[PDB]
Amino acid sequence: RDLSNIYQQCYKQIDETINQLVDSTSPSTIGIEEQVADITSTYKLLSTYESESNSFDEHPTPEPATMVNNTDTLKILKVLPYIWNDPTCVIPDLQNPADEDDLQIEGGKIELTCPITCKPYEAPLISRKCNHVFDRDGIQNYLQGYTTRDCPQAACSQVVSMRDFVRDPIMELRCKIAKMKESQEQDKRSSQAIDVL
Amino acid sequence: AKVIYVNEKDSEHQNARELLRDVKSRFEKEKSNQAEAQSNIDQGRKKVDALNKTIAHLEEELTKEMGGDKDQMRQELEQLEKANEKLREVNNSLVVSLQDVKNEERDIQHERESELRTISRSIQNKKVELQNIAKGNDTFLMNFDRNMDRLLRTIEQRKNEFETPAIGPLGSLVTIRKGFEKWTRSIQRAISSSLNAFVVSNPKDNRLFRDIMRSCGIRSNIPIVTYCLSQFDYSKGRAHGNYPTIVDALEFSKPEIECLFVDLSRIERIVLIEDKNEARNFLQRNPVNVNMALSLRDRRSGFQLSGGYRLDTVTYQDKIRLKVNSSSDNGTQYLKDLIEQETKELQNIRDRYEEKLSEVRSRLKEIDGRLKSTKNEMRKTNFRMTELKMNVGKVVDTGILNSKINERKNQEQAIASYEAAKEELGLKIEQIAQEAQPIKEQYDSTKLALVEAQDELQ
């Protein structure tokens, strides 16, 4: 006798709330760290409750859980402040708990804009060793799917195996607020230049 | 078969949610657009109505000074010109009346100046004739003719010198008898020839006496009448009227001259009978062979009559025509008193003229006053038609005010355009609503259909 998936549903409920917040901040917002901390509290508390409920799946005062947060989906929360700082940031963690070089990028300014066909990334996917990104664009069919050598960039630093390219939601989030804030200055200046002459 | 299967059916939830979002967003956005249209239209019409007639009222204070009376102010010229012409013509009539009355004044003037003094002097002349002794001017001896004085004063020498003796002109042989004054006031108009002339022998002497005029300056050729100095032929009727006749009432220096009277032309047969109709009494029968008579009209004048009823009115005046003991010097009392009594006519008829003249020229004062009133009406109408040069002369300075009317007008056209937009947008929203709300049933059913359990069955 069990009732389980209600709480996967509540997981989805908090996830969809995170997706709500990620793009709802107004240009007038100052700091988000308290919001980040509160979402962290709720997320990790629900994670602990995940163990508190699974403790009886093996089947009160049961055995201690001892599981610790080491999953990939925790990444969805880490980055927001450094998006709030300025567009110069590059952040996807995978490995580093802190920023790219724990503060700085310094890795060659390949940016929102594509390295060659210089448009902003609009349908990207990342690989979790190389950080190569494509939108299945004009690099779509050179030798696609043949992961032994010659991923389309000269002298990379590893041989690769086939996982194509996978989820990364960080990409357009930094673009959104950056463009909003930068265009607000242009709007205000163009206004005040002519306002009441 | 049928192990896990339809767990994927939640996929319908995604399409349901996106359809819900699309329809709801369209509905809300277009409802907000309609609300925007409503608010904008309301605020615009409020904005205009806050000023619509304020400009008109502010304009219509000085503009009313030249206000909608324009039509009648312009047309005032017609009736003012009518007034001008009517005033001119009526004044023409007044001046015609005034100058015609003045023509009457001068006519009546000449009437009295040419008659009053002339006639008064004419009938006063008898007194100078009475009391003058001087050449040329009137004399006692004009009773026949003015210069007859000269002829008789010369005959004073020549009173024998022709084919028979001529001792007298017959005015000294025969004279009016004593005390016959009231019979005498018409002797001139009664007898005309016998007393004037002188005697000759026989009709051979027709050419005889005529032209010894050349002695002193006598005026006229003067008659010849002849009868001998003796009685003749009593063998026929000797007439004697009812009253002392020209036979009874005579005084004689030569008594034998009686006979020629009855032989005269019947101008001897004259009997004064007091009044006009008293002579009408019995001369019809012409008693004792008398034919002519005299009668009274007033103590001045009267009538000449014959036959009993025959009547005529003549010019009685106060001339005597004889050398008489009752001479002109005997009536001096009357000749003075009645003269002073009757010269009254000179002022009487004059007054009878100027009272009427005064009446008419006093009437003229009314038309003179009306002429002045019309001449003042002229300037009154001038100062009233000055309204033309006032209003038309004053340029309509409302333009600096009408500058603001164009926008106040076209704003209502703008509101009409926005109203045309809203009249269709308010129903675009409903048609979007009937697209949306029915679609919501799909989402309702999709959400409903998520139910299924997990059990130990095979």
């Binding site: 009732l3 209600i6 409920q13 969809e16 709330t17 709500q20 917040l21 709802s24 901040t25 107004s26 919001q35 508390l45 409750y49 409920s53 009886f56 009160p60 709007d187 002519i194 306002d195 009441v196 002459l197 | 956005k29 907000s32 004044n91 023409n92 001046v95 008659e115 006639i119 108009r189 020839s193 002339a197 009709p203 002497d205 010849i224 009448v225 002849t226 009868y227 026929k236 009855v262 032989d263 032309s265 004048s301 009538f303 025959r310 005529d312 009115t313 003549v314 010019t315 300037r379 001038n382 040069k389 002369g393 004053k394 340029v395 300075d397 333009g399 600096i400 500058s403 603001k404 926008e407």
Partner: protein, 453 residues
């Protein structure tokens, strides 16, 4: 008691639904945000358009479009010129009033000159003889009465001294001594007995004479043409001119029927042919008219037919007017004065014409004043040009003062709602967080109730 805990779950579902409502509000508020950004786009468009509109409308003020004090000072100045018009109008009105007054002053003289033109020859009316005396004016009124009494006119006409006419006074003297002047001013009987039928008014209302026949032997009044004996020239009644009844009137009413006429100073020398009764029904040889004198002869019933003399001369004086001496006296008393007044009349009509020429000069001045007022109305076309350019200037000022409020309002009115959107975002941020905490707080009141199951 009944069921252990399964009547507790509903709370989590209700809180989940509330979170879903928060999400719906989130999406709605975001959409409102993109709606107000569209409002921002609209206001930006409006300002960018209106600013350029104002810039060019303001530059419209850079042209000359020169105004001056003349905007009202020219009309004020021409006030005195229109007043000059009014003064000329009243002066001309006075001049035409003088024209009318002179026209009337001349109409009377025109009537008189026409009357004189009619009077240029023999009498227009006989009644003019009696104007000299009061009693002659009584005779004038008697003439008017007989004209008012036609049955007394056609039987006793106007006096013979009135009706009769002749070439001159000397020719009118044919009828001057055979009948005395006093008798001469008696109305003219047609047939003997009209005397008794119509005497009264002439002798009582007015005071003049009448007379009756002496004999009525109506035959040739003189024994045949041998009567033209001493040079006698012809027939008295026909030598004078008048009505036949008038001619028969005096025949024996005043003893003129049997009288020859002659310019020669003749005389009734036939006296010796007549020492005899010799009536034969006639008394011819008593009286005649000869030259300018007259001898008189009697025939007495009592007498033995040897007659005795009598005589009177004929005066050439104011009697028997067919005219005022035909020409002689009139030439001076009327003709000369009326010809001088005809010269005066032409002069006065031409002086009224010169007054009308004075009027014509100011007629031309009146048309010139109207034409110069129309030239000032061309200046008024200029004035309307200036005032319509002031209409365009004031219209651009109205447009710019409208844009002044439009920009001032639009820049803030709806743009300030971003504060409301921000506050709603804050409310959403609070609600989502506290309701997630509420949802997480229900834990262990959950299915973990296996202490009592």
């Amino acid at each position: 008691k009944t069921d252990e805990f399964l009547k507790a779950k509903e709370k989590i579902n209700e809180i989940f639904e509330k979170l879903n409502t928060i999400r719906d509000e989130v999406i709605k508020k975001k959409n409102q945000n993109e709606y107000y950004r569209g409002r921002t786009k609209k206001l930006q468009a409006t300002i960018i358009s209106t600013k350029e509109d104002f810039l060019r409308s303001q530059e419209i003020l850079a042209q000359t479009h020169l105004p001056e004090k003349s905007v009202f000072e020219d009309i004020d100045i021409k006030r005195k010129e229109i007043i000059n018009k009014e003064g000329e109008i009243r002066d001309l009105i006075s001049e035409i009033d003088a024209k009318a007054n002179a026209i009337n002053h001349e109409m009377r003289s025109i009537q008189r000159q026409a009357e004189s033109k009619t009077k240029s020859l023999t009498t227009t009316d006989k009644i003019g003889i009696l104007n000299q005396d009061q009693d002659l004016k009584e005779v004038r009124d008697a003439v008017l009465m007989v004209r008012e009494h036609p049955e007394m006119k056609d039987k006793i006409l106007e006096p013979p001294i009135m009706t009769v006419s002749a070439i001159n006074a000397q020719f009118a003297a044919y009828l001057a001594q055979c009948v005395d002047y006093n008798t001469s001013k008696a109305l003219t009987v047609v047939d003997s007995d009209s005397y008794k039928l119509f005497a009264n008014p002439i002798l009582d209302k007015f005071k003049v004479n009448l007379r009756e026949l002496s004999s009525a032997d109506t035959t040739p009044p003189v024994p045949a043409e041998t009567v033209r004996d001493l040079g006698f020239e012809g027939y008295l009644s026909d030598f004078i001119t008048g009505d036949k009844r008038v001619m028969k009137m005096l025949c024996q009413t005043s003893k003129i029927h049997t009288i020859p006429v002659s310019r020669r100073e003749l005389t009734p020398a036939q006296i010796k042919k007549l020492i005899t009764p010799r009536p034969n029904g006639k008394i011819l040889f008593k009286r005649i008219i000869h030259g300018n004198r007259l001898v008189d002869i009697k025939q007495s019933a009592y007498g033995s037919k040897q007659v005795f003399p009598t005589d009177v001369s004929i005066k050439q004086t104011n009697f028997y007017q067919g005219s005022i001496m035909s020409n002689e006296q009139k030439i001076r008393i009327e003709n000369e004065i009326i010809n001088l007044k005809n010269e005066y009349n032409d002069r006065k009509s031409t002086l009224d014409a010169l007054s009308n020429q004075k009027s014509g000069y100011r007629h031309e001045l009146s048309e010139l004043a109207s034409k110069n007022d129309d030239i000032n109305r061309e200046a008024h076309q200029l004035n309307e040009i200036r005032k319509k350019y002031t209409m365009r200037k004031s219209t651009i000022e109205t447009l710019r003062e409208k844009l002044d409020q439009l920009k001032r309002e639009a820049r803030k009115d709806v743009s300030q709602k971003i504060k409301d959107i921000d506050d709603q975002i804050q409310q959403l941020l609070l609600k989502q967080r506290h309701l997630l905490s509420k949802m997480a707080s229900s834990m262990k009141s959950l299915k973990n109730c296996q202490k009592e199951l």
